Design a binder for this molecule. Structure first.
Ligand SMILES: Nc1ncnc2c1ncn2[C@@H]1O[C@H](COP(=O)(O)OP(=O)(O)OP(=O)(O)O)[C@@H](O)[C@H]1O
Ligand SMILES: Nc1ncnc2c1ncn2[C@@H]1O[C@H](COP(=O)(O)OP(=O)(O)OP(=O)(O)O)[C@@H](O)[C@H]1O
Ligand SMILES: [Mg+2]
Ligand SMILES: [Mg+2]
Ligand SMILES: [Zn+2]
Lengths: 649, 204, 175, 190, 443
DNA sequence: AAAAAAAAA
């Protein structure tokens, strides 16, 4: 009755108290006006409020929102729409577009306290309450528009009529249902023609979010919940993404309380009307002094060795492997030609060795430190299901392709373990990807080519239990040469027994195990921790807090932390695209001619494709030092690394 | 640098928990004087370094600010080490007096740790001195009151008592008790408190 | 502030962010190369028991050698988190001597906006403490234990004393 | 004495002792009026009552003497006025009708009750179980009122007009420590 | 009609308020301690109820589903009486209290349940094989009309005693000329509780001759949910009732099921610390024993003679190592593996079953009757909705415990390679039908 | 449509 007006005026008072939101709204308005008629982006009518200030202003309204949003959000939205209408000033508007009536829906950020849950923790007593849930995106539905309000016209009357339709998921408050019956006749029988272009249609999509399997009870499968979101943010993110979704958790449907029930045990349906979505990413933007520090480090002489040594400090030796991983994470550029079609741009690395030489651990480290990566096991995968699958959507009743493991890793890196133990059939499915970086699906009436430009890193064991240095390299490796020729670098590792190395590695490994997490005692095991205190988060250059990287002093050479290295990778993969020059060309051609005509035994045969590997390695090294041109030093280091990987020191 | 000193103090805290959770005086842990003497050696090195630094400061080639800041840092180091050691020893002396005060000042070598060799020799002589003080205290004007007796208020006059260990016969005032193994007495409460405290009787 | 108090001594050993407000040649010998002096505006993580005095000594513009930066434990984010819902907060993870360091920090720097919020926090948590203490069994769900593992180091003493008092009263009552 | 932290508060045994060091009425079964015999001649109790006594008459003795005579057949403890159903009814009505005031009640509350129900079982005119249930109900009501009142803890002072000994003792450490913490927080803030 | 219900409620209230032995009213203090910790539930021991009065026990045994709600509302009446001051006249957010029963009657095997156990209280034991995801159930529904457009509230209990039990919508309106059932459900301002389904299987050693085990379906709600994990032996006290399936052979068929009233488990869901203070003291005392090592070593299979180093290895395996983590994220394994490779007749297999019995979480499987897909992760499809979903095998069922594999050499070469990553990193990765999940398995 | 177990080639 009047409580709606009371809440509306209180929210108007609160909006008038804080002057940031008004500035944002008028900025949106002026940008929208400038987009209209000046020689393709438009800002949506959505604003995000920080409920910390609301709590500091009025505790009653804050509690009402966080406990029963159904009776508090609509008044706030009405007040915001009224403010926007009052402040707006358009003297000559349009006809069809003026009847949009966007209500300026809201988004929230700030501390939630006990209302930040996980998909398993959602229970009965959290219904009808605003919540924020973390999780992983499992699968999505198709974007389908839905009607809101229809526009009708009658020729005889000349008066435009309108009828409004709402559903259970359309509004927070339950109202009397309305069918989709089109009004075609007037009260006096005049004919009504539906007017497209004046009616209102809003986009609709359903997604399902799953709890992270890492934080799960022992011996329990992960559980998932479904989220409905509409209008804006309709097609953000994708399956295989870590998200934080804030919205209202409410039930819907009769659920058998009508006469349709067949058995006693009938349960209701629960669903979340998502209000906002944030990318978790376990942040992604560089600051000014960050760029200053990156430039200062890149102008140093020996940045590349420092960066290589910084990777996985708990692994002894394998320095060239670390350098190869560093060059692979930020490989060369892709080439396209009007007549030359397409040229591959990145690097793939394969390692083979006898057991217990720290390959899987390095693979896990590469998974953890990469921008985007997917873990795959040879035995626990099927090639047909690795690329694409056919699934029938429950809503639309049609069958649509579901993205496979490798497609999700587009512009990423894929790590495969037990590669030599992986079925031969599915191997061809890999080779196709290694051929043109594109998978073709022609099955059940769907003919589509899907882009997959990822890099693949794998580690495999030799045919015997241990490597035989006296045998043919082809004899020791079970994989056929057809796919082995694709990999740019092949590495063979062996645990040669030497008492000096044995003592050094023993001391190192014992040093690692004598570690204690900061601020926690040694008498009790590790305990799980809660989420961050802030549900949604966000003097320069004189501190160098984490810029220098050296957390602990152990050697004269420097070190850098993981976040700074990742920021360096993000900057390098975007801001620099080097161009090769003839000075490095001479060195590359000379060393290729020399290596080809050395005429001695070697691990693998060499052919014309190795020069492409040299070119992209030089490009990657030019990217490492952040230069737009390729110097002969990059050619020299690439040749040295190749000689090490193929001859051995 | 005094971080290793913290390692002692934290350990002392656990000892208090052993004092706390048990709420009883038993099994004082064996000492940690090795870490203490390591700290003493390093603080002796610190003192020697400070004296050398003061020597160079008086010589003239040393800057005054460097000398004063190094002196402050070293003084803080000595202060913290002394604080840690005294914090350990104060609690040790407190628990020592705690179990010394209630066992009639005899240390009960006939029954509690047996050899008491986990205590340092200085701690053992301190315990003997405190037992001497306890013996002297009730030798003054309070000779007719057993200060080391029971502290539970007397609530009943006659209780049932069951024998726990076998002995011969023990004389009392106006009577004698023969301690046959596994026997039950119906006697006065205030005549068997000495035996009960010693552990020869059970089922109060 | 007791000299022979274990808890105070332990709390004195935490590290606080700080910066060298003044440049002193020959310093840093305890952390890096002794012959290399420490330059100006150098950030370090120093323990309380020397940061308190080195920031007040002055030494000599009588500026002290070191300046203490605002620690990450006392930040706006933590303020909002405690002001939203303190009863369910797992304050054990932020620190184990939170109250004593709060006392020391508010003593060094008078701030009227900290005493009130901390007082309200502990007052609100005290009622839950008493509710759990009075709950003597006659063996429990997850809620009691998951609250008990969120406690501060000092609150355990209050909880144990209250539990012992109630247990003794119940034991004497029913005989 | 020290015994860990037992130097700060009273044990329940000490509370029972200090309560039982109180006078009470007795109906003796025997007589030792002087022949107009050994004098009682105690040092912390008026011996005139114990010496000048005659059977089937009212006199006042300390509680522990009454208990000792009750262990023999020389005693018959007279129940107090507030240990009856008709008084407890108006008492519970008083607490229920007044949701802010602790009812008037002797500070030996629950303790004389425990002792009398333990020893003087057969001398009550009312059934024992009904009285015990009424006492339990009073205990529950006062516990609820105490929890309701504790919700505010000022740093200056607090008032509790009608709390018994055991209720005060079982609450002393928590209230004391919380108030001390608040006081020192305020003192350090100024 | 209503007078008998009031008499029964009054009888139960008198029982709960009056039951004392010696000098303690146990149930009232139990209610106080439960309310103080926000656990609105009460546990009734059946022997006390029998001893207090026999008529109430007879009535409860006769018609349990009708009688129980009266008791469970008497409980909440007493709780509001002994917890809230009237103040001469609010939140009152106290729902109906949950009743939990315990008893020591004779057990009944699953195969012995017949038509004579319908709507009776029974006690039985079995093994848990699967747990369903939780669902919501309404308790207080806000009902709104369309034409006359007034408000109404519906109160529904969870006990049914019959297939229908459901008042869907009243016929005609509440008194113009409305429809038959012109009502809707206001989902906001409604109260919901939680329900879960479980599957029970017969205990292996009581299976009859030449037969296969039989499964049964049980339903629990409110605080009894989320208590048992698959693979845990349990003892259940409940009601054996029947429910019709209109969606679903024969004529007038009715599928039976079990409504859970009380659960007892040996593990007691301990695996944070929840042990009693006395038990903790006893464990510390045992750990203080100077020769606990020899005492435990003698305890491993006392009927096996001669083996000593094997028993020490078994003790070291069961105790387990210490898990570690690193700043850069590398994991370090924290388990020990023991392989017995010896001649026949040396009692190799007899130790495996004992190790399975001792360990809190253990599974015993053979290398002959096993498959690579049947151990780590099995990809199944729902016959109804036709959707891929992941079903765990045996290795994931023994996570956090030990796994007993005998005849390790008879295992197929293709199958034996899947365990390599599952033990070298304790994580298994599945890429099947577009599902890309990393699953944890530590054992 | 896609995964998993069984007997014969
Ligand atoms: N250089 C090294 N530094 C540190 N740890 C090492 C090193 N070499 C081996 N290890 C240790 O060896 C163990 C074996 O690890 P892991 O199984 O990942 O190795 P691998 O060579 O990939 O073996 P596999 O062929 O079985 O997959 C790990 O615990 C790892 O810490
Ligand atoms: N040391 C022993 N003490 C007692 N009984 C023993 C011992 N060794 C073997 N047995 C007996 O041998 C019988 C068979 O043992 P079991 O089947 O466990 O042997 P196994 O080594 O596992 O055999 P297999 O290799 O053939 O599977 C059992 O009845 C067992 O009691
Ligand atoms: Mg490995
Ligand atoms: Mg066998
Ligand atoms: Zn009507």
């Amino acid at each position: 009755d009047a409580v709606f007006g009371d809440r509306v005026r209180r929210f108007q008072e609160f909006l008038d108290t804080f002057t940031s939101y008004r500035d944002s709204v008028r900025s949106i308005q002026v940008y929208n006006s400038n987009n209209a008629a000046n020689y393709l982006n438009i800002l949506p009518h959505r604003i995000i409020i920080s409920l910390d200030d609301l709590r500091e202003f009025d505790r009653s309204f804050w509690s009402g929102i966080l406990v029963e949003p159904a009776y508090f959000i609509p008044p706030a939205e009405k007040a915001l729409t009224d403010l926007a209408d009052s402040m707006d000033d358009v003297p000559h508007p349009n006809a069809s577009a003026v009847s949009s009536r966007h209500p300026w829906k809201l988004s929230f950020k700030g501390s939630f306290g006990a209302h930040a849950l996980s998909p398993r923790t959602l229970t009965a007593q959290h219904l009808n309450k605003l919540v924020s849930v973390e999780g992983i995106v499992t699968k999505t539905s198709l974007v389908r528009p839905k009607l809101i309000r229809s526009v009708h016209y009658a020729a005889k009357t000349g008066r435009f009529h309108y009828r409004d339709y709402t559903d259970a998921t359309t509004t927070l408050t339950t109202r009397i249902p309305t069918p989709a019956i089109y009004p075609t006749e007037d009260t006096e029988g005049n004919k009504l023609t539906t007017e497209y272009g004046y009616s209102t249609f809003i986009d609709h999509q359903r997604i399902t979010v799953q709890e992270m399997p890492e934080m799960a009870p022992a011996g329990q499968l992960p559980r998932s919940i479904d989220v409905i979101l509409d209008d804006d943010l309709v097609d953000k993110t994708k399956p295989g993404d870590r998200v934080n979704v804030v919205g209202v958790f409410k039930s819907l449907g009769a659920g058998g309380m009508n006469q349709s029930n067949s058995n006693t045990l009938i349960g209701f349906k629960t669903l979340i009307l998502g209000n906002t979505v944030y990318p978790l990413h376990a942040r992604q933007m560089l600051t000014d002094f960050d760029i200053r520090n990156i430039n200062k480090l890149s102008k140093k002489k020996d940045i590349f060795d420092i960066l290589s040594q910084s990777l996985a400090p708990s692994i002894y030796g394998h320095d060239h492997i670390k350098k190869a991983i560093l060059l692979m994470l930020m490989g060369g550029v892709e080439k396209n030609l009007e007549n030359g079609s397409h040229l591959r741009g990145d690097i793939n690395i394969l390692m083979v060795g006898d057991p217990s030489t720290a390959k899987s651990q390095l693979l896990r480290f590469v998974l953890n430190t990469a921008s985007l990566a997917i873990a795959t096991t040879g035995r626990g995968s099927s090639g047909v299901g690795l690329t694409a699958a056919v699934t029938t959507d429950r809503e639309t009743g049609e069958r649509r392709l579901e993205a496979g493991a490798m497609v999700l890793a587009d512009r990423g890196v894929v790590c495969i373990d037990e590669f030599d133990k992986m079925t031969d059939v599915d191997r061809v499915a890999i080779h196709e990807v290694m051929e043109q970086q594109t998978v073709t699906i022609a099955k059940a009436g769907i003919h589509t080519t899907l882009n997959a430009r990822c890099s693949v890193i794998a580690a495999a064991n030799p045919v015997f239990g241990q490597y035989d240095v006296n045998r043919d390299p082809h004899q020791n490796i079970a994989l056929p040469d057809s796919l082995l020729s694709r990999f740019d670098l092949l590495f063979v590792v062996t645990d040669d027994i030497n008492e000096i190395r044995d003592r050094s590695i023993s001391e190192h490994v014992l040093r690692t195990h004598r570690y204690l997490p900061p601020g926690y005692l040694e008498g009790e095991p590790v305990r799980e921790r809660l989420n961050l205190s802030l549900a949604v988060g966000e003097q320069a250059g004189a501190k160098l807090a984490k810029n220098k990287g050296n957390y602990n002093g152990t050697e004269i050479p420097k070190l850098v932390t993981i976040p700074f290295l990742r920021k360096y990778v993000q900057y390098a993969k975007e801001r620099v695209i080097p161009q090769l020059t003839q000075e490095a060309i001479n060195v590359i051609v000379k060393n290729y001619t020399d290596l080809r005509n050395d005429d001695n035994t070697k691990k693998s045969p060499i052919t014309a494709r190795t020069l492409e590997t040299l070119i992209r390695l030089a490009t990657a090294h030019a990217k490492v030092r952040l230069s737009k041109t390729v110097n002969k030093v990059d050619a020299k280091v690439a040749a040295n690394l190749l000689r090490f990987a193929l001859l051995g020191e | 640098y005094g971080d290793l000193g913290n390692k002692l103090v934290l350990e002392a805290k656990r000892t208090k928990q052993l004092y706390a959770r048990s709420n009883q005086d038993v099994n004082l842990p064996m000492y940690h004087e090795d870490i203490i003497r390591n700290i003493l050696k390093e603080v002796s090195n610190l003192r020697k370094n400070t004296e050398y630094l003061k020597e160079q400061q008086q010589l003239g080639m040393l800057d005054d600010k460097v000398a004063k800041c190094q002196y402050f840092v070293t003084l803080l180091c000595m202060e913290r080490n002394k604080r840690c050691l005294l914090a350990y020893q104060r609690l040790r002396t407190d628990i020592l007096d705690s179990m010394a005060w209630n066992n009639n000042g005899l240390d009960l070598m006939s029954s509690s740790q047996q050899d008491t060799n986990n205590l340092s020799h200085q701690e053992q002589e301190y315990l003997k001195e405190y037992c001497d003080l306890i013996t002297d205290l009730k030798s003054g004007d309070l000779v007719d009151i057993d200060l080391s007796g029971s502290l539970v208020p007397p609530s009943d006059v006659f209780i049932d008592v069951r024998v726990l260990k076998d002995a011969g016969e023990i004389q009392t005032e106006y009577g004698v008790f023969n301690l046959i193994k596994d026997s039950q007495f119906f006697v006065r409460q205030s005549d068997v408190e000495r035996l009960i405290q010693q552990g020869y009787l059970q089922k109060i | 502030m007791g000299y022979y108090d274990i808890d105070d001594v332990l709390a004195d050993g935490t590290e606080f962010p700080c910066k060298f407000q003044y440049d002193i040649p020959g310093l840093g010998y305890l952390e890096n190369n002794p012959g290399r002096p420490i330059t100006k505006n150098t950030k370090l993580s120093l323990p309380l028991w020397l940061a308190r005095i080195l920031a007040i000594v002055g030494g000599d513009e009588p500026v002290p050698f070191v300046e203490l930066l605002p620690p990450d434990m006392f930040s706006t984010k933590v303020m909002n988190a405690i002001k939203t819902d303190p009863v369910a907060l797992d304050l054990h993870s932020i620190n184990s001597h939170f109250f004593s360091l709060a006392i020391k920090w508010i003593m060094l720097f008078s701030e009227k906006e900290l005493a009130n919020v901390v007082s309200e926090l502990l007052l609100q948590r005290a009622q839950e403490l008493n509710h759990h203490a009075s709950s003597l069994s006659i063996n429990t769900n997850i809620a009691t234990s998951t609250f008990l593992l969120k406690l501060e180091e000092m609150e355990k003493e209050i909880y144990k004393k209250s539990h012992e008092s109630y247990k003794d009263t119940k034991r004497w009552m029913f005989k | 004495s020290l015994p860990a932290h037992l130097q700060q508060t009273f044990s329940p045994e000490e509370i029972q002792f200090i309560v039982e060091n109180e006078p009470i009425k007795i109906f003796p079964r025997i007589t030792t009026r002087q022949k107009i015999h050994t004098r009682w001649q105690l040092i912390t109790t008026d011996d005139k009552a114990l010496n000048n006594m005659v059977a089937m008459r009212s006199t006042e003795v300390v509680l522990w003497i009454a208990l000792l005579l009750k262990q023999q057949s020389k005693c018959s403890i007279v129940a107090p006025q507030w240990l009856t159903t008709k008084e407890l009814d108006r008492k519970i009505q008083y607490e229920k009708t007044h949701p802010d005031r602790f009812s008037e009640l002797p500070w030996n509350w629950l303790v004389l009750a425990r002792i009398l129900f333990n020893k003087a079982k057969d001398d009550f005119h009312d059934p024992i179980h009904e009285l015990r249930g009424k006492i339990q109900d009073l205990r529950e009501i006062r516990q609820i009122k105490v929890l309701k009142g504790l919700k505010y803890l000022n740093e200056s002072h607090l008032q509790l007009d009608n709390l018994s000994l055991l209720e005060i003792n079982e609450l002393r450490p928590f209230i004391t420590e919380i108030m001390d913490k608040l006081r020192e927080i305020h003192t350090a803030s100024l | 009609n209503d007078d008998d219900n009031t008499e029964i409620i009054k009888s139960f209230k008198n029982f709960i308020l009056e039951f004392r032995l010696d000098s303690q009213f146990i149930y009232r203090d139990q209610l106080r301690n439960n309310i103080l910790v926000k656990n609105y539930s009460l546990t009734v021991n059946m022997e006390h109820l029998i001893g207090y009065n026999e008529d109430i026990y007879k009535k409860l045994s006769d018609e349990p589903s009708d009688i129980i709600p009266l008791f469970e509302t008497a409980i909440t009446q007493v709780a509001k009486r002994i917890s809230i001051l009237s103040r001469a006249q609010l939140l009152n957010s106290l729902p109906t209290f949950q009743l939990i029963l315990n008893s020591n009657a004779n057990q009944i095997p699953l195969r012995d349940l017949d038509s004579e156990h319908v709507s009776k209280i029974v006690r039985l034991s079995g093994i848990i094989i699967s747990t369903s995801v939780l669902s919501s159930r309404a308790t207080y529904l806000s009902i709104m009309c369309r034409n006359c457009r007034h408000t109404t509230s519906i109160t529904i209990n969870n006990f049914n005693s019959i297939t229908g039990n459901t008042v869907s919508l009243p016929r005609s309106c509440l008194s113009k000329n409305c429809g038959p059932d012109p009502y809707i459900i206001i989902h906001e301002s409604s109260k919901f509780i939680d329900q879960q389904f479980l599957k029970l299987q017969e205990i292996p050693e009581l299976v009859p001759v030449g037969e296969m085990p039989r499964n049964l379906t049980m339903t629990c709600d409110r605080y009894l949910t989320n208590k048992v994990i698959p693979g845990t032996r349990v003892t259940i006290v409940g009601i054996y009732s029947i429910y019709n399936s209109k969606n679903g052979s024969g004529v007038a068929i009715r599928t039976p099921y079990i409504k859970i009233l009380g659960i007892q488990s040996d593990v007691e869901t301990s695996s944070v610390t929840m042990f009693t203070e006395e038990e903790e003291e006893e464990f510390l005392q045992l750990s203080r024993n100077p020769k606990l090592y020899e005492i435990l070593t003698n305890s491993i299979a006392p009927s096996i003679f001669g083996n000593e180093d094997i028993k020490k290895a078994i003790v070291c395996l069961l105790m387990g190592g210490s898990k570690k983590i690193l700043p850069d994220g590398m994991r370090l394994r924290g388990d020990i593996n023991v392989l017995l490779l010896g001649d026949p007749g040396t009692a190799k297999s007899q130790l495996l079953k004992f190790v399975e019995k001792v360990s809190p979480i253990a599974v015993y499987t053979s290398g002959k009757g096993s498959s690579a897909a049947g151990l780590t992760a099995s990809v199944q499809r729902d016959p109804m909705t036709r959707e891929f979903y992941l079903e765990g095998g045996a290795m994931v069922l023994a996570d956090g415990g030990v796994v007993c594999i005998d005849e390790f050499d008879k295992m197929r070469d293709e199958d034996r390679v899947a365990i390599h990553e599952a033990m070298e990193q304790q994580t298994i990765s599945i890429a099947k039908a577009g599902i890309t999940t990393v699953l944890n398995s530590r054992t």
